[PDB]
Amino acid sequence: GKKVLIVYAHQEPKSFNGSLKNVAVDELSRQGCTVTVSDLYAMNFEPRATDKDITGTLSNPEVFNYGVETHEAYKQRSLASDITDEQKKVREADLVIFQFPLYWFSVPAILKGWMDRVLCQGFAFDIPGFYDSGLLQGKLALLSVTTGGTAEMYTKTGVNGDSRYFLWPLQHGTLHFCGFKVLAPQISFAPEIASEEERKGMVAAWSQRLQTIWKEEPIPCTAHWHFG
Amino acid sequence: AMGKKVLIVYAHQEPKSFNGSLKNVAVDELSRQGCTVTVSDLYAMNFEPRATDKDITGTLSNPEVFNYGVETHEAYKQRSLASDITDEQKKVREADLVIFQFPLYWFSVPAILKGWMDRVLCQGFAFDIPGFYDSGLLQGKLALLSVTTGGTAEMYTKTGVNGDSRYFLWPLQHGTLHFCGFKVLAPQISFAPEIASEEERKGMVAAWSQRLQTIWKEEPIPCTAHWHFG
Ligand SMILES: Cc1cc2nc3c(=O)[nH]c(=O)nc-3n(C[C@H](O)[C@H](O)[C@H](O)COP(=O)(O)OP(=O)(O)OC[C@H]3O[C@@H](n4cnc5c(N)ncnc54)[C@H](O)[C@@H]3O)c2cc1C
Ligand SMILES: Cc1cc2nc3c(=O)[nH]c(=O)nc-3n(C[C@H](O)[C@H](O)[C@H](O)COP(=O)(O)OP(=O)(O)OC[C@H]3O[C@@H](n4cnc5c(N)ncnc54)[C@H](O)[C@@H]3O)c2cc1C
Ligand SMILES: Nc1c2ccccc2[nH+]c2ccccc12
Ligand SMILES: Nc1c2ccccc2[nH+]c2ccccc12
Ligand SMILES: [Zn+2]
Ligand SMILES: [Zn+2]
Numbered sequence A: 001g002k003k004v005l006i007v008y009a010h011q012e013p014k015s016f017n018g019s020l021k022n023v024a025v026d027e028l029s030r031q032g033c034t035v036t037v038s039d040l041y042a043m044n045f046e047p048r049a050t051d052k053d054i055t056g057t058l059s060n061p062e063v064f065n066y067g068v069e070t071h072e073a074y075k076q077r078s079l080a081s082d083i084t085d086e087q088k089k090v091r092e093a094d095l096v097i098f099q100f101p102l103y104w105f106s107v108p109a110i111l112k113g114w115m116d117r118v119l120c121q122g123f124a125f126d127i128p129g130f131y132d133s134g135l136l137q138g139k140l141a142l143l144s145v146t147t148g149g150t151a152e153m154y155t156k157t158g159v160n161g162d163s164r165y166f167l168w169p170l171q172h173g174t175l176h177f178c179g180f181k182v183l184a185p186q187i188s189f190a191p192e193i194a195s196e197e198e199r200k201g202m203v204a205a206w207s208q209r210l211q212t213i214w215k216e217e218p219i220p221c222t223a224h225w226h227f228g
Numbered sequence B: 001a002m003g004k005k006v007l008i009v010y011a012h013q014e015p016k017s018f019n020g021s022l023k024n025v026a027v028d029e030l031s032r033q034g035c036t037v038t039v040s041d042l043y044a045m046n047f048e049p050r051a052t053d054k055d056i057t058g059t060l061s062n063p064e065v066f067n068y069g070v071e072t073h074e075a076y077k078q079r080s081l082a083s084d085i086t087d088e089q090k091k092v093r094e095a096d097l098v099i100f101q102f103p104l105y106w107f108s109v110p111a112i113l114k115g116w117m118d119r120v121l122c123q124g125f126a127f128d129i130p131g132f133y134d135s136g137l138l139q140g141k142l143a144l145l146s147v148t149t150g151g152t153a154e155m156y157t158k159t160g161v162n163g164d165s166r167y168f169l170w171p172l173q174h175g176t177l178h179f180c181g182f183k184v185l186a187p188q189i190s191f192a193p194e195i196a197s198e199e200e201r202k203g204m205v206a207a208w209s210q211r212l213q214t215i216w217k218e219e220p221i222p223c224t225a226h227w228h229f230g
Helices: A016-030 A066-075 A081-092 A109-118 A164-176 A196-211 B018-032 B068-078 B083-094 B111-120 B166-178 B198-212
Strands: A003-008 A034-039 A095-101 A140-146 A186-188 B005-010 B036-041 B097-103 B142-149 B188-191
Touching: A003 A016, A003 A081, A016 A034, A016 A095, A016 A140, A016 A186, A016 A196, A034 A081, A081 A109, A109 B111, A140 A164, A164 B166, A186 A196, B005 B018, B005 B083, B018 B036, B018 B097, B018 B142, B018 B188, B018 B198, B036 B083, B083 B111, B142 B166, B188 B198
Parallel strands: A003 A034, A003 A095, A095 A140, A140 A186, B005 B036, B005 B097, B097 B142, B142 B188
Antiparallel strands: none
């Protein structure tokens, strides 16, 4: 009985991200997993980190510090319900898949806000309690990314540099920081110019991999797997 | 000559914050020099971070299947992007220097500002095909990240826990700013104001004030895959 959370950030159901998300739902479910989906755009998820994220009264009214206030709110069960809803989903998940098109070598703002607001201190990490000692230890995480740029453009000698440059902030900076074990990202390069067959090739590749997903080795997340 | 233009894209909730202070020092110094300074205070504007179909005000080209990149590109051409987007582009178009002032969130920009990049820097406006990197459409403009961090300077080196700072900079400076044709000036990184001594804080403010005095004469950094990981 494995739980899976797919955090999904595309505006369009009939999109290539959309298909990757659907396949993952279908395949994983077929194996007896419980798959929950956070369809950020459909939820019209709030990306701004504001004082409205605390329901209670503020630890300090005159000066607002988002980090400090959300920390306190987490422990005191005073965070806004949309945040706590996500946290619950994350908490129960054995695996968290992030499904998104690359925007500016990163996640779309709506998914960046989910990270900013959901992964708060006390919940995803603490001091001490980060990187290997992070609070979400024991959970698995996979980035499923699509790109406009082709694979060659994402090499050490392409116009974009190596892909591990855009993976760093998310995989090390964010996921490893919270204690996740990061599986190899799934990157579908340039589906928009790919052919019908290659697109299906790509969707098929994702489907296949998901079959044996729970047997995979977490990548060694360090400053040697991304720039060397 | 009185009046030459800076846009500060500001991403912090609190006026009395350290970021707030850095923003006011820039406004004050650049104004003292006789520059026009415009500030997009994103949180006060309640700026919309989400890339959605509400960003286009015409009839969609393909209503049955929404493609954000395609639709905004065409909207840009029809001059029918949302006014919030179009207002930001006006500010970018007129500026000679764009400063982004923000606290580091998850080795990157706060979502509200990520939304600004997503929505404001659309195809046809900031880049095209051809017309990116060296031929980016915002060529002839200066850009500067002014970032505050939770981590200490030592924490952001090769041997520190967060790795070299150049890794979190790469996506912003090369992937976004260079891609758009900006000339990128070296980042101002103010490390850990929250836990630094009152003395270290004032120096960080003074150091920023001082750099701004000759900011226009500064040489852009070499935007190279060797500038971040070599
Ligand atoms: C603001 C912004 C910033 C961006 N920044 C970057 C960047 O920094 N780097 C970069 O490389 N790119 C960037 N891009 C481009 C972006 O990443 C790609 O456009 C995106 O990943 C495409 O994914 P998609 O789901 O939208 O593809 P889609 O447009 O949905 O897919 C294209 C085609 O695949 C078809 N398809 C769907 N399902 C199947 C199926 N199962 N099998 C057969 N075909 C199928 C669709 O019908 C469609 O015709 C950016 C885009 C925007 C809008
Ligand atoms: C969701 C989230 C994610 C984060 N991710 C990261 C990350 O990936 N990496 C990382 O390193 N950090 C991270 N942080 C920490 C964050 O970057 C820092 O908290 C932030 O940069 C501090 O800047 P500030 O303006 O908010 O500080 P403030 O708390 O506003 O300032 C600290 C002190 O400076 C004082 N001050 C203001 N003006 C002056 C003045 N003119 N002269 C003297 N003192 C003054 C204030 O009074 C205050 O006491 C994250 C925080 C959050 C909430
Ligand atoms: N901002 C970008 C795009 C926006 C709309 C459509 C395609 C895009 N491709 C990109 C490729 C590399 C960097 C930025 C890109
Ligand atoms: N991911 C981080 C944070 C997330 C939420 C609140 C505060 C944070 N401080 C950090 C300081 C250093 C590195 C990562 C940090
Ligand atoms: Zn790591
Ligand atoms: Zn570059």
